[PDB]
Design a protein around this ligand. Structure first.
Ligand SMILES: Nc1ncnc2c1ncn2Cc1cc(-c2ccc(F)c(F)c2)ncc1N1CCC[C@](N)(c2ccccn2)C1
Ligand SMILES: [Zn+2]
Ligand SMILES: [Zn+2]
Ligand SMILES: [Zn+2]
Length: 220
């Protein structure tokens, strides 16, 4: 029983490393929806927002709804309150403090941004030194988020063969960002989990301890 998780820097945004590619957009390049600020829930989850439908985040200076824009989840870091918990064979995990509804933004998978060469080198080093460092999540080819050295609470989310959350790739301020969203209603106090199918089957000493009835037995 370790009382505290391994060291890492709690950040609020992805941090690039080495020769990885980063993209940005000036306020002028960000898409503009046709929501009004007088709408029931402008750019909201139940709204007909053009930007929301296409998984584009509105910018504060660009949106016609102004400050009443409800499509700024990633930038404002609008996460349901969560708590890190300790399980048996799964170790540290994440549960939420309030009920979460289906489709709702849960968190952003944040970390050190690395290219594929760098990721492969880290995994090879981990496998040789027997380190359980699988905080790597692919954005696209040659861009991988490594939440091992630095990340936010999303790194505490465990893998589940029957997950209650899923990753969705959104465009925010000119670049791709990985959001965690609920696939069903989640009662407060339930462990937040997602399906980790973004890497290789490097399951040497690791085994699927999700507990789901459809468990295939591995993580890759
Ligand atoms: N479904 C799981 N079955 C067994 N172990 C799991 C499962 N899902 C996540 N973990 C743990 C784990 C495995 C992999 C992993 C391994 C192989 C893979 F193929 C893969 F996709 C992921 N990367 C990270 C973790 N964590 C994340 C949460 C905190 C953690 N539990 C922890 C850390 C320190 C102390 C206690 N606990 C370690
Ligand atoms: Zn809108
Ligand atoms: Zn908006
Ligand atoms: Zn399983």
């Amino acid at each position: 029983s370790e009382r505290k998780p391994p060291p890492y820097k709690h950040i609020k945004v992805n941090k690039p490393y080495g020769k990885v590619q980063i993209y940005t957009a000036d306020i002028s390049e960000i898409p503009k929806c046709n929501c009004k600020p007088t709408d029931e829930n402008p750019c909201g989850f139940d709204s007909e927002c053009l930007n929301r439908m296409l998984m584009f985040e509105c910018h504060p200076q660009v949106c016609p709804a102004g400050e009443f824009c409800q499509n700024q989840c990633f930038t404002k870091r609008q996460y349901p309150e969560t708590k890190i918990i300790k399980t048996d064979g799964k170790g540290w995990g994440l549960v939420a403090k309030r009920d979460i509804r289906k489709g709702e933004f849960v968190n952003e998978y944040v970390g050190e941004l690395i290219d594929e060469e760098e990721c492969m080198a880290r995994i090879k080093h981990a496998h040789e030194n027997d380190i359980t460092h699988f905080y790597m999540l692919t954005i696209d080819k040659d861009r991988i988020i490594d939440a091992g050295p630095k990340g936010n609470y999303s790194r505490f989310m465990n893998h589940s063969c029957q997950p209650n959350c899923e990753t969705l790739k959104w465009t925010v301020n000119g670049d791709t960002r990985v959001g965690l969203f609920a696939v069903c209603d989640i009662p407060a106090g339930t462990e937040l989990t997602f399906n980790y199918n973004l890497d290789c089957l490097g399951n040497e000493k690791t085994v699927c301890r999700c507990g789901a009835s459809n468990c295939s037995g591995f993580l890759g």
